[PDB]
Design a protein around this ligand. Structure first.
Ligand SMILES: [Zn+2]
Length: 42
Protein backbone atom coordinates (compact mmCIF):
# COMPACT_ATOMS: atom_id res chain seq x y z
CA UNK A 1 0.00 0.00 0.00
CA UNK A 2 2.29 2.75 1.27
CA UNK A 3 3.30 4.46 -1.97
CA UNK A 4 3.27 8.23 -1.65
CA UNK A 5 0.71 11.00 -2.09
CA UNK A 6 2.21 12.82 0.90
CA UNK A 7 2.82 16.56 0.76
CA UNK A 8 1.66 18.74 3.63
CA UNK A 9 3.63 20.14 6.55
CA UNK A 10 7.35 19.92 5.76
CA UNK A 11 9.92 22.59 6.73
CA UNK A 12 12.80 20.74 5.07
CA UNK A 13 12.83 20.69 1.27
CA UNK A 14 15.30 19.17 -1.20
CA UNK A 15 16.50 21.79 -3.69
CA UNK A 16 18.38 19.15 -5.68
CA UNK A 17 15.07 17.72 -6.88
CA UNK A 18 12.37 19.48 -4.87
CA UNK A 19 11.45 16.83 -2.31
CA UNK A 20 10.24 17.54 1.22
CA UNK A 21 10.34 16.03 4.72
CA UNK A 22 9.18 16.65 8.29
CA UNK A 23 12.62 16.17 9.82
CA UNK A 24 16.05 17.09 8.45
CA UNK A 25 17.32 13.61 9.33
CA UNK A 26 15.06 12.43 6.51
CA UNK A 27 15.85 15.08 3.90
CA UNK A 28 19.59 15.08 4.58
CA UNK A 29 19.32 11.31 4.18
CA UNK A 30 17.54 11.61 0.83
CA UNK A 31 19.73 14.31 -0.72
CA UNK A 32 22.57 11.78 -0.56
CA UNK A 33 20.89 9.95 -3.44
CA UNK A 34 21.90 12.65 -5.92
CA UNK A 35 25.19 13.94 -4.50
CA UNK A 36 26.03 10.39 -3.50
CA UNK A 37 25.37 6.89 -4.83
CA UNK A 38 24.32 3.74 -3.00
CA UNK A 39 22.57 0.88 -4.83
CA UNK A 40 22.83 0.18 -8.56
CA UNK A 41 19.40 1.73 -9.14
CA UNK A 42 18.08 5.26 -8.71
ZN1 LIG B 1 16.09 15.28 -3.77
Amino acid sequence: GSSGSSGGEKPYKCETCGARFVQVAHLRAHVLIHTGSGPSSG
